[PDB]
Amino acid sequence: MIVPVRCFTCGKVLADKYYEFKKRVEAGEDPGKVLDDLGVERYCCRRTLLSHVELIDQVMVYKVY
């Protein structure tokens, strides 16, 4: 279930700044400074980057119309 392309409260795009976000959190860098380094200001933008599942990998492979 790929990342939502808007937030749910603050209308602002987010799906361009998720796959750049996650490849810099599996190096050990703290997420409190990674999300601040990008353009995320409030905490209504930020509760929907910091908690997500991206489960599209499992469902895709089964292959059925």
Partner: protein, 293 residues
Amino acid sequence: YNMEDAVIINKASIERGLARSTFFRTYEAEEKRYLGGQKDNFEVPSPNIQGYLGEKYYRHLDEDGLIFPESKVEGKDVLVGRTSPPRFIEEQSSLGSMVLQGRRETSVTVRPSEKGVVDKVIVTETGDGTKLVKVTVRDLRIPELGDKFASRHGQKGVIGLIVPQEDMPWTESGIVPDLIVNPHGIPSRMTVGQLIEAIGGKVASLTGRRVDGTAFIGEPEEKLRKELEELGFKHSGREIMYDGITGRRLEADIFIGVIYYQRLHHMVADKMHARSRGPVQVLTKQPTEGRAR
């Protein structure tokens, strides 16, 4: 509108993605074998045959009797056209049944209040020798009024109304709330864990790390209200809020947090029904039981 356990969800927040949930069913029409040797074949029903459901309900079937997928099946539309075999040509002889000798139309059709679009048609053979087709139809189901939400603390309720984003009491930041909970239910039901979790969402969204909250050894009470007090907000959640109809600071400091809710399946399209005059009992001429009958 949010009195006595209701809640007022945002409009533009529904209309961007909150709780858009899907619903599935499935149907299991088959091909039986009687002990006489006559096996019922399924096809496109002709106009003649006895027990016709109707006409112009068969606009979605193909030649062999299977709905090709992704078609907006609605109402009482058919799913598989089944012809049954004569079934006692010589039992009654009720003054006209000797000459007709035809077949009695039986089939399967969606339950007569739902809607949606088909998803996948299966076709196989089961154990003995026969053949059975399975059809499944989905649904879209936007969250309108009636749809019961609940917390995990036990504050169940129903959507009160669906107010636009513009008329929302909003705060001295870019925050516009979604679920405006009634304040008359927290110091009456003794649910203080609601209020600790609501601050714990605001601390653990600004800091970055998801606060541990297990029983008896979890994150303590005092360490949250100090990390909130040093990140730029008041020690108790309370903030200055402006109304959206007129626009002036409400002379109080309105509490606000992040609470994890969850949608439940007591949705309104599975409850509402009306009955004017329907089919009745044979023995008593009284109505039947259940929506499936």
